[PDB]
mmCIF file of C-alpha atoms in Angstrom:
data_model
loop_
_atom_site.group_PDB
_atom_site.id
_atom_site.type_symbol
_atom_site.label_atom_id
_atom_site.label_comp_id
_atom_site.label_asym_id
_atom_site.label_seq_id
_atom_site.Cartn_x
_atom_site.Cartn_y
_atom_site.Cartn_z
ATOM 1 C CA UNK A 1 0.000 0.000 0.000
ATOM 2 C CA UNK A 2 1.619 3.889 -0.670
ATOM 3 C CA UNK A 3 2.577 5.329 2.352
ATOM 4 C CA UNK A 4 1.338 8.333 4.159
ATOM 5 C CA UNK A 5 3.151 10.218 6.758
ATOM 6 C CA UNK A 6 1.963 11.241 9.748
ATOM 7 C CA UNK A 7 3.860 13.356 12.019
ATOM 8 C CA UNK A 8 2.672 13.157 15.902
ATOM 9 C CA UNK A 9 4.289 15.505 18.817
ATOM 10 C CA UNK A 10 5.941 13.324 21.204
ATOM 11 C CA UNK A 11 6.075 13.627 24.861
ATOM 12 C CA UNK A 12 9.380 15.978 24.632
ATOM 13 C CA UNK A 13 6.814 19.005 22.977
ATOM 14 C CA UNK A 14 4.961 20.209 26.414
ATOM 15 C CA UNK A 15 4.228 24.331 25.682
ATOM 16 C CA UNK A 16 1.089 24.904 24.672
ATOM 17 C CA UNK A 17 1.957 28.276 22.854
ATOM 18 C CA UNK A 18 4.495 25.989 20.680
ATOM 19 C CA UNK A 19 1.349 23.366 20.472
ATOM 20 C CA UNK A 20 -0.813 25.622 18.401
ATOM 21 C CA UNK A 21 2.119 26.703 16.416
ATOM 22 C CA UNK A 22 2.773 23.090 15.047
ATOM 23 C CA UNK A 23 -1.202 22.552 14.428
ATOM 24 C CA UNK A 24 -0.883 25.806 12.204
ATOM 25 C CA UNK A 25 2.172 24.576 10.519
ATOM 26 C CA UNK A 26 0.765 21.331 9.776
ATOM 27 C CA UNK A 27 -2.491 23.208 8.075
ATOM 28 C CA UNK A 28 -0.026 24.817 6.099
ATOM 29 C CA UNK A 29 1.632 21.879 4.670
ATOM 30 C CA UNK A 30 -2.180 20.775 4.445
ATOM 31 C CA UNK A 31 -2.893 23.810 1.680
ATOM 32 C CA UNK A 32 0.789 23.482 0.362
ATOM 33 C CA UNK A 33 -0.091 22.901 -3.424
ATOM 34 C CA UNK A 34 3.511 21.581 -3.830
ATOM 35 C CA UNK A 35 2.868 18.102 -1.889
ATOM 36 C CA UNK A 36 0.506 15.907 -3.718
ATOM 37 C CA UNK A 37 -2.912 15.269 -2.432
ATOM 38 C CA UNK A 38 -2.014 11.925 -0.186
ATOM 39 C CA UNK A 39 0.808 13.843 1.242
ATOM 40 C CA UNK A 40 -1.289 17.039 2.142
ATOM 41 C CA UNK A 41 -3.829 14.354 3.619
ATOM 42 C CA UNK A 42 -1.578 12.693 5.847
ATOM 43 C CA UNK A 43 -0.917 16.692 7.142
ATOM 44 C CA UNK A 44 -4.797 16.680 7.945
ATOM 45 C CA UNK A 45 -4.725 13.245 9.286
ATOM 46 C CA UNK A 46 -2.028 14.834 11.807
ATOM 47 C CA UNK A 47 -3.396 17.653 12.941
ATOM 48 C CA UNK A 48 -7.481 15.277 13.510
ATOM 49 C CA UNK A 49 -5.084 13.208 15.583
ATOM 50 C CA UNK A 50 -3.844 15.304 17.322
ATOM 51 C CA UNK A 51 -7.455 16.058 19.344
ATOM 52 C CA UNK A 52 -6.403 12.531 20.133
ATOM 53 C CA UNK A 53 -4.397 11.556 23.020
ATOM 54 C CA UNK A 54 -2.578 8.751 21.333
ATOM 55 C CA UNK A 55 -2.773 9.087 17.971
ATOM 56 C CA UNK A 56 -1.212 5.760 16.859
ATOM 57 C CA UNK A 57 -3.884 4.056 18.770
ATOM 58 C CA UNK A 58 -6.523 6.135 16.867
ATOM 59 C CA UNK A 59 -4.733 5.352 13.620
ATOM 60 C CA UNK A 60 -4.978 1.929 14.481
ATOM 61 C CA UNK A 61 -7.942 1.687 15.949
ATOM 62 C CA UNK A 62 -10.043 3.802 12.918
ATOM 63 C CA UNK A 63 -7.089 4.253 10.155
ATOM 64 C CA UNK A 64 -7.202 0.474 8.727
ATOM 65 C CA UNK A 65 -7.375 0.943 5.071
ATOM 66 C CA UNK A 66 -7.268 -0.885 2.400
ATOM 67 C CA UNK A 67 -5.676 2.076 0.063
ATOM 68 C CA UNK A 68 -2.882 3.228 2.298
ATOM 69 C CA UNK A 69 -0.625 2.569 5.151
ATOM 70 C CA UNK A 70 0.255 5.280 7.683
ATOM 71 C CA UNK A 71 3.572 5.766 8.872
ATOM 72 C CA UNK A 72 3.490 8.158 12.376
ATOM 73 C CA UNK A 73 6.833 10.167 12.671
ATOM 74 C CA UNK A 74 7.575 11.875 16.151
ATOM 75 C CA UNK A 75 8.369 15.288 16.443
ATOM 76 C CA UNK A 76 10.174 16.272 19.122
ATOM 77 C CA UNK A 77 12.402 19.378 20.848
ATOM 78 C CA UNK A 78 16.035 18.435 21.357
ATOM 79 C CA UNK A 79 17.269 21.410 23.855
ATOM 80 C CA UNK A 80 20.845 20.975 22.062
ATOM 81 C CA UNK A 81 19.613 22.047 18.446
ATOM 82 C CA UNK A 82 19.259 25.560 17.740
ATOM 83 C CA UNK A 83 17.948 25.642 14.161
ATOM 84 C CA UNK A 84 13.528 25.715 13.773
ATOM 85 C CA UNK A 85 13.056 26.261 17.664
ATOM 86 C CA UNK A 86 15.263 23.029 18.817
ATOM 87 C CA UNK A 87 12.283 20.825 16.913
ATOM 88 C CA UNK A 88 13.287 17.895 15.177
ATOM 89 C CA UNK A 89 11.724 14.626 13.533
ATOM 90 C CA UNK A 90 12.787 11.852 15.266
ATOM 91 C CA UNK A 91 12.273 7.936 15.109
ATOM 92 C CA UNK A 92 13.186 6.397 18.222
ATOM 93 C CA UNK A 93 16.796 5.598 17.595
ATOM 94 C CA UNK A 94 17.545 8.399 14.641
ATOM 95 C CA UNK A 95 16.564 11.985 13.660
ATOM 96 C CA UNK A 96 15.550 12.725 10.230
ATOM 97 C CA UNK A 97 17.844 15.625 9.134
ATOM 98 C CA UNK A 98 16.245 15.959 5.637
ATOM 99 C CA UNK A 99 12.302 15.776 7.069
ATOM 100 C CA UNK A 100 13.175 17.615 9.811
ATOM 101 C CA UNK A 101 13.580 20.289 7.168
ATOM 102 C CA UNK A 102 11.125 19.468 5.104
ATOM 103 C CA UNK A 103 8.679 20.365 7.780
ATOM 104 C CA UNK A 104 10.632 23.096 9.531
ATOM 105 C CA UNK A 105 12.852 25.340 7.011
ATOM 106 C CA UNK A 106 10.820 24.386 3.697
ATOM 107 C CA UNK A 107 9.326 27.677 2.270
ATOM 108 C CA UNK A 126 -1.252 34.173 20.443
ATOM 109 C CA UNK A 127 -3.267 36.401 22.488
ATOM 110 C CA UNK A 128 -6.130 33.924 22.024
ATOM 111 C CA UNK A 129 -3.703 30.989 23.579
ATOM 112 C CA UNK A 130 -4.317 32.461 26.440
ATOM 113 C CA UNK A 131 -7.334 34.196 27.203
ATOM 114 C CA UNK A 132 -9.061 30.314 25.712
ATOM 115 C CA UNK A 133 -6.642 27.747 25.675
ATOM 116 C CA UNK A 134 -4.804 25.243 23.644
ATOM 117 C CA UNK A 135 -7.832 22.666 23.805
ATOM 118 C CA UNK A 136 -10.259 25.622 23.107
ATOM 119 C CA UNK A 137 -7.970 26.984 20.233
ATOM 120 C CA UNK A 138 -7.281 23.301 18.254
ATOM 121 C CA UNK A 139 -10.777 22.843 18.670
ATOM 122 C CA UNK A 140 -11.335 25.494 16.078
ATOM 123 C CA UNK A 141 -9.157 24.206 13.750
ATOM 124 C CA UNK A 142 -10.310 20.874 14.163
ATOM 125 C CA UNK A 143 -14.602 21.366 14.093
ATOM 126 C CA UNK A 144 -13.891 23.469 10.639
ATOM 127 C CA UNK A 145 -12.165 20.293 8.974
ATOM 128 C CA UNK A 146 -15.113 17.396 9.672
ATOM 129 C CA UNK A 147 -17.858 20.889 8.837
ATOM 130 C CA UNK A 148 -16.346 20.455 5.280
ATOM 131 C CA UNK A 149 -17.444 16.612 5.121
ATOM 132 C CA UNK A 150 -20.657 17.238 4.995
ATOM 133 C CA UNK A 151 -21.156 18.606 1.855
ATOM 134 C CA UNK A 152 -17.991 17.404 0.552
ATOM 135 C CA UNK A 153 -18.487 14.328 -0.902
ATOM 136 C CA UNK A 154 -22.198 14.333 -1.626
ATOM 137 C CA UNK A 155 -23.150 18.617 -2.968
ATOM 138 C CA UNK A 156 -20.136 19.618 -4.163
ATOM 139 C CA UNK A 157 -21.240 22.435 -5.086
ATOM 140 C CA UNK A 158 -22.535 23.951 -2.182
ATOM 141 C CA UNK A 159 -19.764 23.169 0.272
ATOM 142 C CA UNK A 160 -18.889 26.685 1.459
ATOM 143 C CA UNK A 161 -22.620 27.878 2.031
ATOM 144 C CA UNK A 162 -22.919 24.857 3.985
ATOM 145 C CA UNK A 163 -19.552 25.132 5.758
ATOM 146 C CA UNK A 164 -21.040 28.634 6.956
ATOM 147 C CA UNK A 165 -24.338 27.695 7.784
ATOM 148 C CA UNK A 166 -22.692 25.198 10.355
ATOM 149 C CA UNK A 167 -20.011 27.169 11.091
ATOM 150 C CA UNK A 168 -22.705 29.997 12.725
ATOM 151 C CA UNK A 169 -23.510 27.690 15.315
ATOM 152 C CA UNK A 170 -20.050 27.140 16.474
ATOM 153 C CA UNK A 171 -18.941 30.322 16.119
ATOM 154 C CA UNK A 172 -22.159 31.523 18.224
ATOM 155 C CA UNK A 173 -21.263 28.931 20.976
ATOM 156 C CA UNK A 174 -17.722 30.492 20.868
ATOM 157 C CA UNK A 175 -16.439 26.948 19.883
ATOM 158 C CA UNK A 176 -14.949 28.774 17.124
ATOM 159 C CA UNK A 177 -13.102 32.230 17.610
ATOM 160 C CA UNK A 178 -13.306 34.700 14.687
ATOM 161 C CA UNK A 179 -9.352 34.824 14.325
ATOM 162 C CA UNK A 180 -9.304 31.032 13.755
ATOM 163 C CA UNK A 181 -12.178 30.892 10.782
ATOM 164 C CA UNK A 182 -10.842 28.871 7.743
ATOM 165 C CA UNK A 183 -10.567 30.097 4.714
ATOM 166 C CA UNK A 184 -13.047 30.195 1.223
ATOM 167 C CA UNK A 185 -9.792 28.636 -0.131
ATOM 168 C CA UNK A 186 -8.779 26.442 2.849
ATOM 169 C CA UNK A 187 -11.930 25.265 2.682
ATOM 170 C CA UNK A 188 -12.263 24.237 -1.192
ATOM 171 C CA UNK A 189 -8.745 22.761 -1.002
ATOM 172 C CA UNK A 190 -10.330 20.297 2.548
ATOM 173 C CA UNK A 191 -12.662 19.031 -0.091
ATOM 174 C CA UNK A 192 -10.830 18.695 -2.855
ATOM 175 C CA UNK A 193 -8.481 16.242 -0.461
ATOM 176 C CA UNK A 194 -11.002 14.513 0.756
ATOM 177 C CA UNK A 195 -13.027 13.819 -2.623
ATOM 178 C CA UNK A 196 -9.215 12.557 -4.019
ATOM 179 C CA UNK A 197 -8.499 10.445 -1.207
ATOM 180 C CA UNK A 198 -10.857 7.753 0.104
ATOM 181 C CA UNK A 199 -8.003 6.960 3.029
ATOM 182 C CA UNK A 200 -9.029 10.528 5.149
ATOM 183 C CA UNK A 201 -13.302 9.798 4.198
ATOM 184 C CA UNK A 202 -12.909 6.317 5.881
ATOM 185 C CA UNK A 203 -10.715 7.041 8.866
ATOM 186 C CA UNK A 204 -13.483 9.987 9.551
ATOM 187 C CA UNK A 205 -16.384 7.425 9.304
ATOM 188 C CA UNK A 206 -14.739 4.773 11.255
ATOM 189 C CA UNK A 207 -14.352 7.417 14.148
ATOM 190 C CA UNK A 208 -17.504 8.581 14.136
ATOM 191 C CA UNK A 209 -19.202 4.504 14.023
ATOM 192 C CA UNK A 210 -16.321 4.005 17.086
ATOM 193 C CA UNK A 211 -18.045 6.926 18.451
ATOM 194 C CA UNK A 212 -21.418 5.071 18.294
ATOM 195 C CA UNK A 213 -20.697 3.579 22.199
ATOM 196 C CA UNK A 214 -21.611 5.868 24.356
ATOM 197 C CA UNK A 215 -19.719 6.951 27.425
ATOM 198 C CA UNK A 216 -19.219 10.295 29.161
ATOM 199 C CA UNK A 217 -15.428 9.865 28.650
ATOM 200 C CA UNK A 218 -16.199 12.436 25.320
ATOM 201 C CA UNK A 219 -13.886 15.539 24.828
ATOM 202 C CA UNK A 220 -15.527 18.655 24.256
ATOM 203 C CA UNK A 221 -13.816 18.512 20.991
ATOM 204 C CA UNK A 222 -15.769 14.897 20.692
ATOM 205 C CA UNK A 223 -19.163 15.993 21.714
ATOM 206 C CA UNK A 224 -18.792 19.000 18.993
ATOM 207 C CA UNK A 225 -17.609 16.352 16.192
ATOM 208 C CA UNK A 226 -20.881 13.839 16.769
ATOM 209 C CA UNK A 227 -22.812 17.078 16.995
ATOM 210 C CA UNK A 228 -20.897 17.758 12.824
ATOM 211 C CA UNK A 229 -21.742 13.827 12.167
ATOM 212 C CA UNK A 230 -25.560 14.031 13.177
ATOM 213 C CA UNK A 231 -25.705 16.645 9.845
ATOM 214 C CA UNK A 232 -22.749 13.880 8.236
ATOM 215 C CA UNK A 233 -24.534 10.836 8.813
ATOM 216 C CA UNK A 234 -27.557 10.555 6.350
ATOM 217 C CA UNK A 235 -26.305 13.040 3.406
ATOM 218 C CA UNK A 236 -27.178 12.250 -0.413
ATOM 219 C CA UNK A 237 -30.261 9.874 0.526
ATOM 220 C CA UNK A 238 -32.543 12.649 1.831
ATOM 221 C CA UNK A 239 -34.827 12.450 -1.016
ATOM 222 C CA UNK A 240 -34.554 7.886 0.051
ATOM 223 C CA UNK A 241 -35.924 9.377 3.442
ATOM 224 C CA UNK A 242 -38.493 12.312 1.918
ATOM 225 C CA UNK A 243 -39.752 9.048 -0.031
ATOM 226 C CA UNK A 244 -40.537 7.317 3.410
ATOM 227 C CA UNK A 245 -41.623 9.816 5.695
ATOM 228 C CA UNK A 246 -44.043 11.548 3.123
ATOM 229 C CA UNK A 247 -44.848 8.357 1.344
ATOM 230 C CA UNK A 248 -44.747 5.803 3.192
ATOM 231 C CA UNK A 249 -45.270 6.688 7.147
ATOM 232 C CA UNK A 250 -48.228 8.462 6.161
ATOM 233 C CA UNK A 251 -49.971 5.022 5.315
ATOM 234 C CA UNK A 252 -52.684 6.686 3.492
ATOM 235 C CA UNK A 253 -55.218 4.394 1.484
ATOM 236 C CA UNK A 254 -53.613 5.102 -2.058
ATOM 237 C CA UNK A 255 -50.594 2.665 -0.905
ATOM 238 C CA UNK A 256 -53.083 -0.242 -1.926
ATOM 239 C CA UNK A 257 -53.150 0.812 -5.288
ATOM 240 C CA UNK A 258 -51.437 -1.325 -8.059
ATOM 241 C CA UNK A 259 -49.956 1.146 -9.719
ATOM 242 C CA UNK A 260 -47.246 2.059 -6.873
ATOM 243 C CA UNK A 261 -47.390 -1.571 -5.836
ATOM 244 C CA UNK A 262 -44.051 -2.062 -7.756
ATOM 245 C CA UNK A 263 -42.006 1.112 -6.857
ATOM 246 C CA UNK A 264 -42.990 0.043 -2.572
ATOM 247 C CA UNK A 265 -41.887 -3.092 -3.363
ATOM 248 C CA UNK A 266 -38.292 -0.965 -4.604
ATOM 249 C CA UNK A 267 -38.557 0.876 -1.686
ATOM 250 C CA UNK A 268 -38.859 -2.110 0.192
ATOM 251 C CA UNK A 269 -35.516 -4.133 -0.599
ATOM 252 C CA UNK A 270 -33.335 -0.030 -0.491
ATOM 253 C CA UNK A 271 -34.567 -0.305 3.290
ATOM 254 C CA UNK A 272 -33.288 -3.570 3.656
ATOM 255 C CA UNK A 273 -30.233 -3.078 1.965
ATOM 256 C CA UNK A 274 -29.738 0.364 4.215
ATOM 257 C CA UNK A 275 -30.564 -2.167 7.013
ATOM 258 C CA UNK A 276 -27.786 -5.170 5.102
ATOM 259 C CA UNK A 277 -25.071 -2.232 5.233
ATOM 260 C CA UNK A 278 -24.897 -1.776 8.975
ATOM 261 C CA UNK A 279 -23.620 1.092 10.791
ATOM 262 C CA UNK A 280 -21.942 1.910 7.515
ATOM 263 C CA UNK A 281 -24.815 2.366 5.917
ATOM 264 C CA UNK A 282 -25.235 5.917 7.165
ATOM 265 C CA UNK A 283 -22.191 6.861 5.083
ATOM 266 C CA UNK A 284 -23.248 4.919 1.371
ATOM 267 C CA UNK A 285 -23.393 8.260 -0.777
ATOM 268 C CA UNK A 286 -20.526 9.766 1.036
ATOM 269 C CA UNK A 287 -18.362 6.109 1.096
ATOM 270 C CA UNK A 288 -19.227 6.481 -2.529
ATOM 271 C CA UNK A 289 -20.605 2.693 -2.289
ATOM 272 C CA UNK A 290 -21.496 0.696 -5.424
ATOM 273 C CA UNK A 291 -24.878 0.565 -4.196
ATOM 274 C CA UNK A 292 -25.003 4.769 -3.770
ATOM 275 C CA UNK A 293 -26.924 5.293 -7.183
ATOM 276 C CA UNK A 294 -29.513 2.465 -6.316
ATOM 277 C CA UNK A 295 -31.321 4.797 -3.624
ATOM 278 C CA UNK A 296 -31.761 7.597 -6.034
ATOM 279 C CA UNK A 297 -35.695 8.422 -7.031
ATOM 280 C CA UNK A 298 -35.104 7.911 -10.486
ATOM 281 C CA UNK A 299 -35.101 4.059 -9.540
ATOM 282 C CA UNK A 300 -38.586 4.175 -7.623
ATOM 283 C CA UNK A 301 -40.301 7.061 -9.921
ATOM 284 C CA UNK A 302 -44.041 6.924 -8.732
ATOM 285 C CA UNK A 303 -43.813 6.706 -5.395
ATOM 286 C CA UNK A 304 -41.313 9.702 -5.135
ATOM 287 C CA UNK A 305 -44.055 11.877 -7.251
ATOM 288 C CA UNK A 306 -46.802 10.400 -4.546
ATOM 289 C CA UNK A 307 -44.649 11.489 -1.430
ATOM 290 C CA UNK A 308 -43.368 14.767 -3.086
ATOM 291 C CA UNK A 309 -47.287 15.902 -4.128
ATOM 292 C CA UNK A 310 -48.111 14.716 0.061
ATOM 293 C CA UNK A 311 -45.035 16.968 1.025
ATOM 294 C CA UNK A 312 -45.965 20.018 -0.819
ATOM 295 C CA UNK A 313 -49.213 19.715 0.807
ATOM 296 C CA UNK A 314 -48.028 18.735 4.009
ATOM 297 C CA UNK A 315 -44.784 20.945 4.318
ATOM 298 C CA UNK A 316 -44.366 24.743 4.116
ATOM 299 C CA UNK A 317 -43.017 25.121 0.515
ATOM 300 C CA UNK A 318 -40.829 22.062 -0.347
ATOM 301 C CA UNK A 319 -41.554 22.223 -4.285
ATOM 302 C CA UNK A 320 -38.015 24.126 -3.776
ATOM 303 C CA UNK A 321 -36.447 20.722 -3.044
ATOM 304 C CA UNK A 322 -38.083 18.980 -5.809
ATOM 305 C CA UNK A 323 -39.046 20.727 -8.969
ATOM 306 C CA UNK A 324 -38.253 19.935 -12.682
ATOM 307 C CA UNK A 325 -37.377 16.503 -12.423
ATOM 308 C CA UNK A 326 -36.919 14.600 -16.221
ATOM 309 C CA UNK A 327 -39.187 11.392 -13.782
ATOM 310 C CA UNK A 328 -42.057 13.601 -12.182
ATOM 311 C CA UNK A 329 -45.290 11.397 -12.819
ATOM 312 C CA UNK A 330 -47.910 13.985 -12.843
ATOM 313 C CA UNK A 331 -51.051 11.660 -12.116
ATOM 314 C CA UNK A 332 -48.866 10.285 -8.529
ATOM 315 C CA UNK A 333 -47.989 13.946 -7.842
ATOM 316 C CA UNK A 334 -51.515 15.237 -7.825
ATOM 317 C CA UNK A 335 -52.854 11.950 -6.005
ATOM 318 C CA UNK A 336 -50.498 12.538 -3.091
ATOM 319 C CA UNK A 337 -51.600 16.185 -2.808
ATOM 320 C CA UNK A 338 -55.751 15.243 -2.885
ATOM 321 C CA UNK A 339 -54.827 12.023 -0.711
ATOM 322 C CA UNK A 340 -53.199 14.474 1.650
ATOM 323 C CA UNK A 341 -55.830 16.911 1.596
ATOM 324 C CA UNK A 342 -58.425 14.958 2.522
ATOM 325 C CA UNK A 343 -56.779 14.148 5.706
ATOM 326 C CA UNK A 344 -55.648 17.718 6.583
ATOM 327 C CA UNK A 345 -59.402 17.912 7.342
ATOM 328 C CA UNK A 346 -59.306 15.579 9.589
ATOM 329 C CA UNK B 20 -30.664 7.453 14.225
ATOM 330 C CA UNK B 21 -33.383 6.981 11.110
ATOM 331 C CA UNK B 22 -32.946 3.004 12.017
ATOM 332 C CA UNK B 23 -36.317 3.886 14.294
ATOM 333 C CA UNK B 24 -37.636 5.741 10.340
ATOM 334 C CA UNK B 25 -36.762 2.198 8.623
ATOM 335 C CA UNK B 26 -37.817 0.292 11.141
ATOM 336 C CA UNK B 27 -41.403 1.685 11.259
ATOM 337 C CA UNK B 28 -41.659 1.521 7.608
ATOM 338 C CA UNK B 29 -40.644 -1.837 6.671
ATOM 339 C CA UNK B 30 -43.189 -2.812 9.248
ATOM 340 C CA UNK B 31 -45.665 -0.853 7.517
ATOM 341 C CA UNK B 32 -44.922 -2.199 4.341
ATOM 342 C CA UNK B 33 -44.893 -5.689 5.369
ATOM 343 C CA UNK B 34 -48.598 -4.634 6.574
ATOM 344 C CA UNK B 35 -49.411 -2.862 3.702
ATOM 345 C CA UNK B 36 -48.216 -6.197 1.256
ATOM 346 C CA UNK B 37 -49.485 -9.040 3.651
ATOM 347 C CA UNK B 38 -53.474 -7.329 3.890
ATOM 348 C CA UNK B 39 -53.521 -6.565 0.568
ATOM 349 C CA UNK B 40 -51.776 -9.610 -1.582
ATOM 350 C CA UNK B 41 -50.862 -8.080 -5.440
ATOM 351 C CA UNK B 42 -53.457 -4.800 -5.154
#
């Protein structure tokens, strides 16, 4: 498997001013347009980790992948050195001269009126924000990275000196749509999150708060199919005509179900099975549930307007089958 | 969790197919 590096501070690296300096230094490398896309990963993969009190364990625990194999690198301060603030990278028995470089010599106030924790935290909350809309609406990444980000920001989670970036924040994506490795590690915490116990950093509670929004993104019109089709169990379900499409509907439940805690993740996992749950596939029942939504829900022919499969006859069903039992 | 959403629904369906065989 190609190799990633991941750089982790060792025990020797205590000062929490010199802390937040490294996490900005490894965002840096992050955006450096230089490094390739795996190598700029493995930079974000460092600085998620570090939130993590041993990040090999993490790694291990949540980094097994099938496309590449992580190698952790300490960095640590040797008092003797005076070149790039006494910091070196150093394997247990050796100190990489060149890397040390390559890290250090290639071309505040907040510290301490928050914290270290308070300040990474920042840093760290942005990065998962962009996985929401990364993978599945492309497109509308930054509006969505905002329309988290107010919350957080609100809280104070997120200070207004440490707000990413339009660009920081198109180049997160970009990384994550190119590598598969960073997506699955991200998933894999967040299902190893699934136990519950109150030993959750604040930094943890925030990112399961991020992967509530995370966890069912690209099947929403799957769900919109369900709750406004199905749940509703109004009499029209009997008919034959939709008989076939809730039979569809049927078996993409069960396969969600087959999946597992995984299945959460399909459209953002990218998963063979992604395009299966898409309303093209189940045409009828999607025009029955979206004519029972417009009645039922305060606009909603936003979400669902021009579509190439719209039957007509389902739509206005739904919306008379709906509006008979608004009356009652 | 919409595992509770699924849940619910299959059931329903099953219902839905087992009272009324073919339409």
């Amino acid at each position: 498997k190609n190799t990633v590096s991941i750089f982790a501070l060792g025990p020797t690296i205590t000062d929490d001013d010199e802390k937040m300096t490294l996490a900005l230094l490894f965002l840096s490398h992050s955006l450096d347009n230089e490094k390739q896309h795996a190598q700029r990963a493995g930079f974000l993969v460092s600085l998620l980790s570090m939130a993590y009190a041993n990040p090999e364990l993490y790694l291990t625990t949540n980094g097994s992948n099938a496309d590449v194999k992580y190698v952790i690198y300490m960095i640590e301060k040797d008092l003797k050195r005076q070149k790039y603030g006494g910091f070196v990278v150093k394997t247990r028995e050796m100190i990489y001269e060149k890397t040390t470089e390559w890290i250090f010599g290639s071309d505040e106030d907040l510290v301490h009126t928050f914290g270290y924790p308070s300040c990474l935290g920042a840093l760290i909350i942005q990065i998962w924000i962009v996985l929401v809309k990364a993978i599945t609406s492309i497109s509308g990444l930054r509006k969505g990275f905002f329309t988290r980000l107010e919350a957080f920001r609100q809280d104070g989670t997120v200070q207004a000196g440490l707000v990413l970036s339009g660009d920081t924040v198109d180049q997160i994506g970009s990384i994550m749509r190119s590598q598969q490795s960073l997506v699955t590690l991200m998933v894999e915490t967040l299902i190893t999150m699934n136990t519950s116990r109150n030993d959750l950093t604040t930094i943890e509670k925030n990112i399961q708060i991020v992967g509530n929004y995370i966890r069912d993104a690209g099947l929403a019109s799957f769900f919109n199919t369900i709750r406004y089709g199905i749940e509703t169990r109004m009499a029209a379900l009997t008919l034959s005509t939709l008989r076939p499409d809730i039979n569809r509907l049927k078996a993409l439940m069960e396969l969600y179900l087959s999946k597992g805690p995984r299945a959460p993740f399909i459209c953002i996992l990218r998963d063979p099975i992604h395009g299966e749950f898409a309303p093209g596939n189940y045409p009828a029942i999607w025009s029955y549930a979206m004519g029972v939504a417009v009645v039922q829900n305060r606009a909603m022919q936003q979400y669902v307007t021009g579509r190439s499969y719209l039957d007509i006859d389902m739509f206005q069903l739904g919306q008379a089958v709906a509006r008979d039992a608004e009356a009652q | 969790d919409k595992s509770t959403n699924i849940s619910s629904a299959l059931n329903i369906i099953e219902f839905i197919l087992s009272t009324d065989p073919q339409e």
